[PDB]
Structure formats: structure tokens, C-alpha cells
């Protein structure tokens, strides 16, 4: 451990925070300040319209879609007292989920996944949350998230979310993320069902490529889901003063959910390995059949050619004047040995 | 004391004594020139390129008050980069690289640095280094290098070496892009060998870059009396640069492993294809030459007279059986 400082970079001025991503098509800010009685929501683009809600009596939810504009991120972090290294972590995308507990806020890094049925690619969007005393700050890369049910609960007064503080808002966001992971695993179920129905009767190299792609996706999901278990454990077992003594059982429930998700991921990886093994066994069996045909034809015919060669030389002194002309006896011997070899093959159950 | 490696012995000594007001430089080839430079308060940079000749390095070893174990380490070139802190100096082991694009070869060269008060030692093994920018900075007073002590010179040498690693990463990035383009589409028998060479080079890179990060960490984390606290942020910056290098190397190794895997898959299809070819060719021919041998025998009774010109009948039945097996192999989707 050591003191937190803005890490230096080569070919880059010290004060620059760089968005480590590839989504640069959109930007907006969602604000949902809700009390137990009334709530007001809006969408803006000016940064300064959301700064007043830092010292908010009631919980407020700020959703800054689009971090490619680092200016808004830096301004919000400066106004909310966020550490510069935390802002660097927000803009950095190529990193694993984590939390860092500070004096005034907790900083959670999370991942969102979307599965495409065309060519079977898995895409990861990093989402980060900051739980201050009276607000939740959420940053996203691009438009399109999974917290729509939480928004519906906030707007329609379904549940206890309006009667609770920002810690319940954080819990609801994490729960929505876990539900998204469950739906993603269902989609992987559908993909594995398709792969099963294809591999058994249509084996080829494209099936190998698809199987390896699915295995890579499973590896990525495990690598990103294990730190989710770590982070939920650290949330409900190392509770800071920001998180109330209550709502801890909700964090425990989410931890149980992520344990279930990790176990499901492991079983999925085992199943895809089994599919690969089935394909290997099938191609090996085809190789067996080809080997069997080749060795059977060789076993049947090579003795025949060899004996034809033995009696096909020219020495001018051979017992070639025998009863029944000899040559028919040679053919009878060859037929007998050929049918003997065929009978041995039939006894060993080849062809 | 013996030299482990294989490079040519070219014993050349460079001396660069500099101060804030003015510097002084001379290039000689005698050992005695660098002995009297342990007293000047002005920082002095001492180079000994030809480490192969153990006589000069031994004279340095007893004159500079260092244990012969570090002399053995200096001569030992097959050594990972490690740093040693001692009561009177610091010994740092580093590695210099040179990637030839033509042969796709990643060569290495161990250079060791010893920092005594008011002087810096440095031992190459081949002609040519990458610390020329530091030489120009000292010569033309381009920076604050002449306003600072020898710890700043050690920092500058390490930083220039890190920049050399950055240039190496640029070259290897170009090569990885080209090789990925060649592997993903239009494979060939040479691309697999190129990919293996790239993987070996990346393994050497990581094995030489992780100890460098550890050396920088152990360098700035603790401050021995030889080093001042002024250079600690500078060494922190160098440590961050090594973090960048390590992350890039890891990503490159992952990419190369993916390219290896995509080729490694689907070999059983090739085995099935070569089986198909061999079995089809060897099946429609062994019976044919068998019949040829039967009719090529030397028995006297065999009927070989007229019979609709003779050989036409055997040719006809031979073609019949050939097309029979051809039609059979048309089944099972072999042909």
C-alpha cells in the first residue's frame, strides 16, 4: 500500500485525464431527485445544472451518459470533491471491478454485457458509481443501460425506494446489474442450445471456431464476475459509515446472487468443453473408419500381389507342370487366404 | 572472474565530468584515467564498454571499494535485472535490447550501473548504447542535469533506457499488426514460424520487464543515503512508465496467444482430408495392379489367346471396378 497519486504517463501532459475507450457518439445527463412525496426528473447537457444537487436534502440520482467528454467528468469531480485518481479510474475502462472506500464516498466500478446473436460477440460496457452523502453519481460510456426497472420504481412509487436514502438507490442499481447478468446467462443458454443442435450432426471447422469463441467469452465472464463477488463481499462485510447498518441484508442477497452467477458460469464452461470433446470424438471415429477401410484393403490384397510376384518371376525351373495345371490351384489358395482374412476381419467386427 | 557471454572484446573508456558552470569530456583507452575521478564534487560519468577484459573491471573493483561478488555479477551477462543497496553505493542491473526487423530477432545486452558519491559507473559489453540523449543534455545544458548530483544522472540513464523500451514496443506493435493481418487471412507455412518467433520475443520481453519494474519500485520506495529525496518523484515517473510497458507487453502476449490458438484448432479436418486422399488413391489401384500381376504370371496353362482380342476384357472389367469404387466414394460425401 502507498499514498494515492495521479499516475504519470509517457507522451502525455501530467494534468490530462484520457478516456480509455471507443464510444464517442453521444452525451447527456439524467437527473432524478426524488423525495418520499414528490420527485422531479429531467435531461440536460449543461454540466452546471447538476452541481447544485450535491447538497440535496433528498436522494438524487445523476446519470452522466458519455464519458468521452472528459471536461464534464473533471468538472463534476472537482465540484463533488472526488479525488483525481478516482477520476482517472472513472475514465479508464480497461480495468476490473473494484471499490475504494474514502472518507466521504465509495467508488464502485462495474461492467455491463450485451450479447449479439450475429457472429456471437460479447461486448463490455464499464459503468461506475459514486455514493456520496446525499447523491449517487453514475457514469456510462454510451446510451443504453439496464437500470430501467429502478427508474420505473422511482417514478411510479413501487416499493420502498422513495422512503429510503441513497444507499437503497445504490443497492437497486447493483440489483439491476445482477439481473442483467442473469439475462445474459440465459442468452448464453440459448447459444449453447444452438451449438449442441449443430455440432452433433454438422461437424466442421466453423463449429470449432464457434466453440473456441464461446470458451473465450466464458473465460472473460468468469474473470469479470469473480471481482464482483469480491466487491459485494467487501460491501456488506466492511460496511462504511456511508452505508447504513440497515440494507446490509440486501447486499448479502446480491452476494448470494453473484455466487449463483459464478457457479452457473463454471457449469457453462464445463458444458462447452463437453461439446468440444464430442466433436473431437466424432472426427476421431471418422478417422477410425477411414483407417479401417485402408487397412482392410491392404490386408486383403497385398499378400495376393506378393504371391503373384513370387510366381511371376522367370527362373526357367519351377514346378509349373502340376495336376489341375497348378495355376488354378494357386488361385484357389489365394481365394482361400482372402476369404480367411475377410472372416478374421468379420470376427474382429471391422466393416 | 570470467566473461559468460560471447561478444567481442573492445575495451574503450569514456569519461564525462560535468558541473553547473562547464563540463569536461575526453575519450581514452587506459585504465588509469578513471582512477582519480573519485574526489571531484562535480558529478562524473565513467563508461567502460569492453567489459570482456576483466583486468580493467577488476582494477575498478578493488579501487572502488566493492565486493568481488558484484564484480562476478557484472561479468555475468545471463542475469535478470536486480538492484542491490550497499552501505556506500548502489548496484543496478539492466538490459538493453535491439530488434532487427529483417531477421525478427530480439537481441539483449546487459549494462550495469554503480552509483558512488559524486560519480557514476557504467559497464557495457558492445559498442553503441542509447544514452546519447543524456550525453547531449549534459553537453549543451539542455536541462537541469548539470544543476543536480549523480543520482540525477542515474535517473537519466534509467529513463533513457525506458524510452528505448518504448521504441521497441512501437516496432513490435507494427510487427504484431502485420502478423495478425497475415494470420487472420491468407495463412502460409511461414506465418506460423513468424508467430512462434514473436511469442518467444514477447516471453523474453516480459521476463526482462517485470524485474525492471521491481527494481524501480525498490528504488523509489526506500531512500538510501546515497540517493537524495529530490529524485524520488522522478523514479516514481520511471516506475509508472514501466507499468505502461508491462501492460502493453501483457496485451501483446494475449493477442499472440490468440493467433496461435486460431491456427492450432482444426487439425483433425486436415487429418481427415489426407486420409480421404490416401485411401481413395490406394483403394482403386491395389486391386488393379493385383489383376495385372495375376495376368503377368509365368504359368503356361493360362488362357491368353484371342478371346475378343484378349486384354480388352481385363481392361473393361478393370475400368468397371474402378468406376464402382469411384461411385462408392461419391457416397458418404467424400468426393
Amino acid at each position, epitope marked *: 500500500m502507498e499514498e494515492k497519486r495521479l499516475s504519470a504517463k509517457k507522451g502525455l501532459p501530467p494534468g490530462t485525464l484520457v*478516456y480509455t475507450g471507443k464510444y464517442r457518439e453521444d452525451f447527456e445527463i439524467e437527473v432524478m431527485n426524488y423525495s418520499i412525496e414528490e420527485f422531479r426528473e429531467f435531461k440536460t447537457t449543461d454540466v452546471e445544472s447538476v452541481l447544485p444537487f450535491r447538497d440535496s436534502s433528498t436522494p438524487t440520482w445523476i446519470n452522466i451518459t458519455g464519458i468521452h467528454r*472528459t471536461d464534464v467528468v473533471q468538472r463534476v469531480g472537482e465540484f463533488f470533491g472526488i479525488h483525481p485518481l478516482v477520476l482517472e479510474d472513472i475514465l479508464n475502462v480497461h480495468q476490473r471491478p473494484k471499490v475504494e472506500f474514502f472518507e466521504n464516498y465509495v467508488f464502485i466500478v462495474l461492467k455491463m454485457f450485451t450479447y449479439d446473436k450475429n457472429l456471437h460477440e460479447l461486448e463490455s460496457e464499464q459503468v461506475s458509481l459514486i455514493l456520496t452523502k446525499n447523491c449517487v453519481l453514475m457514469f456510462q460510456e454510451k446510451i443504453g443501460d439496464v437500470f430501467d426497472p429502478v427508474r420505473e420504481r422511482i417514478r411510479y412509487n413501487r416499493g420502498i425506494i422513495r422512503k429510503k436514502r441513497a444507499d437503497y438507490l445504490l443497492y437497486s442499481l447493483i440489483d439491476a446489474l445482477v439481473d442483467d447478468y442473469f439475462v445474459l446467462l440465459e442468452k448464453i443458454d440459448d447459444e449453447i442450445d444452438v451449438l449442441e443442435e449443430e455440432v452433433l450432426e454438422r461437424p466442421e471447422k466453423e463449429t470449432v471456431q464457434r466453440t473456441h469463441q464461446l470458451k473465450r467469452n466464458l473465460v472473460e465472464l468468469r474473470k469479470t464476475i469473480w471481482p464482483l463477488r469480491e466487491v459485494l463481499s467487501s460491501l456488506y462485510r466492511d460496511v462504511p459509515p456511508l452505508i447504513e447498518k440497515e440494507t446490509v441484508p440486501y447486499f448479502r442477497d446480491v452476494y448470494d446472487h453473484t455466487i449463483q452467477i459464478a457457479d452457473t458460469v463454471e457449469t457453462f464452461r464445463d458444458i462447452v468443453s463437453g461439446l468440444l470433446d464430442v466433436y473431437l470424438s466424432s472426427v476421431s471415429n471418422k478417422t477410425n473408419e477411414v483407417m479401417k477401410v485402408l487397412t482392410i484393403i491392404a490386408t486383403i490384397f497385398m499378400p495376393l500381389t506378393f504371391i503373384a510376384g513370387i510366381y511371376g518371376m522367370n527362373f526357367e525351373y519351377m514346378p509349373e507342370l502340376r495336376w489341375k495345371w497348378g495355376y488354378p490351384v494357386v488361385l484357389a489358395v489365394m481365394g482361400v487366404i482372402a476369404v480367411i482374412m475377410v472372416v478374421y476381419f468379420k470376427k474382429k467386427k471391422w466393416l | 572472474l570470467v566473461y559468460t557471454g560471447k561478444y567481442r572484446e573492445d575495451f574503450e573508456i569514456e569519461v564525462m565530468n560535468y558541473s553547473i558552470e562547464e563540463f569536461r569530456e575526453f575519450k581514452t583507452t587506459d585504465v588509469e584515467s578513471v582512477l582519480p575521478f573519485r574526489d571531484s564534487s562535480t558529478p562524473t560519468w565513467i563508461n567502460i564498454t569492453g567489459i570482456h577484459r576483466t583486468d580493467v573491471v577488476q582494477r575498478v573493483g578493488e579501487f572502488f571499494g566493492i565486493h568481488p561478488l558484484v564484480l562476478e555479477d557484472i561479468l555475468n551477462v545471463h542475469q535478470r535485472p536486480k538492484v542491490e543497496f550497499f552501505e556506500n553505493y548502489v548496484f543496478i542491473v539492466l538490459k538493453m535490447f535491439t530488434y532487427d526487423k529483417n531477421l525478427h530477432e530480439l537481441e539483449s545486452e546487459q549494462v550495469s550501473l554503480i552509483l558512488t558519491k559524486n560519480c557514476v559507473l557504467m559497464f557495457q559489453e558492445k559498442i553503441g548504447d542509447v544514452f546519447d540523449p543524456v550525453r547531449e543534455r549534459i553537453r549543451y545544458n539542455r536541462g537541469i542535469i548539470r544543476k543536480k548530483r549523480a543520482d540525477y544522472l542515474l535517473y537519466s540513464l534509467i529513463d533513457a533506457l525506458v524510452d528505448d523500451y518504448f521504441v521497441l514496443l*512501437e*516496432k513490435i*506493435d507494427d510487427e504484431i*499488426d502485420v502478423l495478425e493481418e497475415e494470420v487472420l487471412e491468407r495463412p502460409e507455412k511461414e506465418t506460423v514460424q513468424r508467430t512462434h518467433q514473436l511469442k518467444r520475443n514477447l516471453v523474453e520481453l516480459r521476463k526482462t520487464i517485470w524485474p525492471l519494474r521491481e527494481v524501480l519500485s525498490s528504488l523509489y520506495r526506500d531512500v538510501p543515503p546515497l540517493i537524495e529525496k529530490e529524485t524520488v518523484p522522478y523514479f516514481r515517473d520511471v516506475y509508472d512508465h514501466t507499468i*505502461q510497458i508491462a*501492460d502493453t507487453v501483457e496485451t501483446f502476449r494475449d493477442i499472440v496467444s490468440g493467433l496461435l490458438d486460431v491456427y492450432l484448432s482444426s487439425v483433425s479436418n486436415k487429418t481427415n482430408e489426407v486420409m480421404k486422399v490416401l485411401t481413395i488413391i490406394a483403394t482403386i489401384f491395389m486391386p488393379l495392379t493385383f489383376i495385372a500381376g495375376i495376368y503377368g504370371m509365368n504359368f503356361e496353362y493360362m488362357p491368353e489367346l484371342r478371346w475378343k482380342w484378349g486384354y480388352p476384357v481385363v481392361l473393361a472389367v478393370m475400368g468397371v471396378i474402378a468406376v464402382i469404387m469411384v461411385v462408392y466414394f461419391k457416397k458418404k460425401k467424400w468426393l
Partner: antibody, heavy 128, light 107 residues
Framework: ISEVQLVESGGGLVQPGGSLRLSCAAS????????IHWVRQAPGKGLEWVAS????????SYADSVKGRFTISADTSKNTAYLQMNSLRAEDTAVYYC???????????????????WGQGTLVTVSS | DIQMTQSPSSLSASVGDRVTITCRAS??????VAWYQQKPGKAPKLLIY???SLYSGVPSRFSGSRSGTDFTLTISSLQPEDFATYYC?????????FGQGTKVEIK
């Protein structure tokens, strides 16, 4: 608020060896969080890069052809960058574009920037 | 420094055709190459950045590629408003340089 716009003014006729400063007014963004570039284009010539400035760190960088003469600076309060030209030779008669660039990520070691918005160009001519 | 060589320096093609403009780097630039276009009398406009990525707010007909130190801008289909001058630019180093340009006119 409003749209991003880079505005350049102050470029015009000058005798050889005469020093004139170019100011790059910026609207729609804060100059502190971005890097402001200057780009020069002679009549019937390609684009050429001349200078750069990092306001949030005071880091400057100049092209070799103009290094030592041109000096770049940008005060945060006025939200405007300045490029002071002196000893302006006859070969420098051109039109000056002021731009704004953002950093993007390729690999851990490698960074590159691209210029979103340009101005309109001040025609700095040198004659007599 | 680092130099780009953009060829051809003047191109002629008709609307609906396919245009391929390639510029090579004197040394390594790790995909830190961006493409621009400038109609005469107006400031340049960004088209492609990072040598592959299409900018936000430009037509999808434009494309960019990288092959070692070779960078190609390809237009799937020309348009009457696409007849301008195209440039290269490297930004790997702190000193960024432009290609000499490539004009396009009708044929």
C-alpha cells in the same frame, strides 16, 4: 451552453522581421481541459503543424522549422490562446488555423490526438 | 522527425467510383494516424481517427485501414460533395506532421 467555436484574429500584413501576435478566442468549452493547436498552410501548399500548448500543465511543443522564434501561451481566465511570432520571415506568408484536439487511446504506451474543431484562418502575409 | 508520403498528389475519378488514398510513414507510428479533408476556402474537417475509427458526424462511406506503416483511406462511393483535398497526419510523437495532400476532381 452554445456551440463549440474556435475564433482567431489579429493576423494581417507585416513587414519582414516584424513581430505580430495571434490570439485564438475559444467558445463553447474551457481551454484548460483541452490542448489547443496552431496549423499553418502556405498558399498552394499542404497543411503543416507549427505549435502546441497544454494549458492545464503549461507544456509546450513547437515544430523544428519555427522552434525558438514562435512562443505559445494560453491564459485560463480569458479562455484564449496566443501564438507570439517574431522575426517573421518571408517564407511564413500563409493562413493560420487554430484547432482543438482530444486524446485517444490505442495501447497503454501509445497515445494520439485528433482535432475536432478548427477556426477559419487568419491570412498572415509578409511583403516589402 | 517522422514524415508521411501521400500518393497520389492529385487524383481524378468519377462519382460512384472507389477511391484509395495511401500514405506511408518513414518510421513507426502505432496506429496514431488521422485523416482530414479540406474544401478550398474552408477549414479542414476530421474524417477518420486512430487509422480505423470513423468520426462522429461523418458519412459511413469513408473508411480507414492500417497495414504496418501503410495507412489507406477508402471511399466506398464518391459523391458530388466529396471532391476535395485529403490529408494524412501522425500523432505518435509530440511533433505531429501532415502528408502533402491528395486532391480529387472529376474525370
Amino acid at each position: 451552453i452554445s456551440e463549440v467555436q474556435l475564433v482567431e484574429s489579429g493576423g494581417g500584413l507585416v513587414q519582414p522581421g516584424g513581430s505580430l501576435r495571434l490570439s485564438c478566442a475559444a467558445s463553447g468549452f474551457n481551454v484548460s481541459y483541452y490542448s489547443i493547436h496552431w496549423v499553418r498552410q502556405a498558399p498552394g501548399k499542404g497543411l503543416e503543424w507549427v505549435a502546441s500548448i497544454s494549458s492545464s500543465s503549461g507544456s509546450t511543443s513547437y515544430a523544428d522549422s519555427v522552434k525558438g522564434r514562435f512562443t505559445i501561451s494560453a491564459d485560463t481566465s480569458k479562455n484564449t490562446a496566443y501564438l507570439q511570432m517574431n522575426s517573421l520571415r518571408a517564407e511564413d506568408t500563409a493562413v493560420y488555423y487554430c484547432a482543438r484536439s482530444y486524446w485517444y487511446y490505442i495501447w497503454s504506451y501509445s497515445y494520439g490526438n485528433a482535432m475536432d474543431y478548427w477556426g477559419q484562418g487568419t491570412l498572415v502575409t509578409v511583403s516589402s | 522527425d517522422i514524415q508521411m508520403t501521400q500518393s497520389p498528389s492529385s487524383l481524378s475519378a468519377s462519382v460512384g467510383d472507389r477511391v484509395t488514398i495511401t500514405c506511408r510513414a518513414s518510421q513507426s507510428v502505432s496506429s496514431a494516424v488521422a485523416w482530414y479533408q479540406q474544401k478550398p476556402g474552408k477549414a479542414p474537417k476530421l474524417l477518420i481517427y486512430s487509422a480505423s475509427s470513423l468520426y462522429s458526424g461523418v458519412p459511413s462511406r469513408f473508411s480507414g485501414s492500417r497495414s504496418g506503416t501503410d495507412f489507406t483511406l477508402t471511399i466506398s462511393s464518391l459523391q458530388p460533395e466529396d471532391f476535395a483535398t485529403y490529408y494524412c497526419q501522425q500523432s505518435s510523437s509530440s511533433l505531429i506532421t501532415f502528408g502533402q495532400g491528395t486532391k480529387v476532381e472529376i474525370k
